């Protein structure tokens, strides 16, 4: 739901919204270790539940449309900056 960083999440939304306590969040991921969709490297000096790779969703057709700000972003930005490299690496065409 938040795609961005702070993926080393504190347990606060975990202990709040997922109706769990502080002593069980480890079980909440160690059982999830037996699940294996997410394999976070959970901090234990700060109790921070870290986010690694996941099985994300099932369907967000509003983001099958609204994926343009990532897909076309990737397209014209890796392609445009591709042409910024090749526009810098221009007259070594030789």
């Amino acid at each position: 739901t938040r795609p961005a960083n702070h993926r080393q999440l504190t347990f606060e939304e975990i202990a709040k919204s997922a109706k769990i306590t502080v002593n069980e969040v480890e079980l909440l991921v160690m059982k999830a270790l037996s699940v294996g969709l997410v394999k976070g490297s959970i901090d234990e000096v700060d109790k921070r539940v870290h986010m690694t790779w996941v099985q994300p969703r099932v369907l967000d057709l509003q983001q099958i449309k609204g994926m343009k700000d990532r897909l076309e972003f990737w397209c014209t930005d890796v392609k445009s900056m591709e042409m910024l490299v090749e526009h810098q690496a221009h007259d070594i065409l030789t």
């Binding site: 795609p3 961005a4 960083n5 790779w53 996941v54 099985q55 994300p56 969703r57 099932v58 369907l59 057709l61 099958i64 449309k65 994926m67 343009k68 700000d69 990532r70 897909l71 076309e72 990737w74 397209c75 014209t76 890796v78 392609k79 591709e82 042409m83 490299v85 090749e86 690496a89 070594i92 065409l93 030789t94």
Partner: protein
């Protein structure tokens, strides 16, 4: 379970002169033919094939012509020259398919453990790959219907087997082996950047046209499943790879230390004997 085959362009040049047949025999546009070869492994080689006199009605597209005068006795000739080079599959041109193709596969799956259909290219202008394989698949659904048989995208390649360049690399008459770091890398930059991101534009054709007019394979079973793989790193503002920047100090660490010390060694390389042979050539001229 097929990754790749070895493609000899010899009988592809027989697809070239049968591509010369179809331009002068008449109405038949597409070059369709039957692929010889031998399963050795997941990797395979194709050494021969043959191109079929074939017709295809535009109305009820599943009308095949694979004559068995043309099949059996020519398999007796092709068996008679070599017991090894028997059938492995078949081919046709066009990029996508043919409403008859699946049936044409099943005519020769009685002949082969895996009759492959490798859809071929007579006029290469492509952004992706050359001719590519399609193996026998039964993926059906999670539904429990009668068994699906349409032959799915099972990766292949153009492999090069043996010497054969007494002809080929004599017929190069243009090309140079680049010592990579000599523009070949930017050729790959144009082809993967451009030819990858126009395929990304095909993927916005997918993820825009399927939102627009796309039915049931809009989200069959791989779109969200590889929106995971899209969710490696698609994030919003700058994606914030904070590990990757002092990790990048561990990276550019290496390249700038090697370039620094090593290109100072290159300063000895160029500079020193450049001066010696320089001034020998200069003042020893007198």
């Amino acid at each position: 379970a097929v990754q790749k085959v070895v493609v000899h362009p010899l009988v592809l040049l027989s697809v070239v002169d049968h591509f010369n047949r179809i331009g002068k025999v008449g109405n038949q546009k597409r070059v369709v033919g039957v692929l010889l070869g031998s399963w050795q492994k997941k990797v395979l080689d194709v050494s021969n094939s043959f191109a079929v006199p074939f017709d295809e009605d535009d109305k009820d597209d599943s009308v095949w012509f694979l004559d068995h005068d043309y099949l059996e006795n020519m398999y007796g000739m092709f068996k008679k020259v070599n017991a090894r080079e028997r059938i492995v599959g078949w081919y046709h041109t066009g990029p996508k398919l043919h409403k008859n193709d699946i049936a044409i596969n099943e005519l020769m799956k009685r002949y082969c453990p895996n009759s492959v259909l490798v859809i071929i290219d007579v006029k290469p202008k492509d952004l992706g790959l050359p001719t590519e394989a399609y193996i026998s698949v039964e993926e059906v659904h999670d539904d429990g219907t009668p068994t699906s048989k349409t032959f799915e995208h099972v990766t292949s390649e153009i492999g090069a087997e043996e010497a054969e360049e007494v002809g080929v690399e004599h017929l190069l008459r243009d090309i140079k082996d680049t010592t990579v770091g000599t523009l070949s890398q930017r050729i790959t930059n144009q082809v993967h950047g451009l030819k990858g991101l126009n395929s990304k534009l095909l993927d916005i054709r997918s993820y825009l046209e399927k939102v627009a007019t796309g039915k049931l394979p809009i989200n069959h079973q791989i779109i969200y499943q590889l929106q995971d793989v899209f969710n490696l790193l698609p994030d919003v503002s700058l994606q914030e790879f904070v590990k990757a920047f002092y990790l990048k100090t561990n990276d550019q660490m290496v390249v700038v230390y090697l370039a620094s010390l090593i290109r100072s060694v290159v300063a000895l390389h160029n500079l020193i004997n450049n001066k010696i042979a320089n001034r020998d050539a200069e003042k020893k001229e007198g």
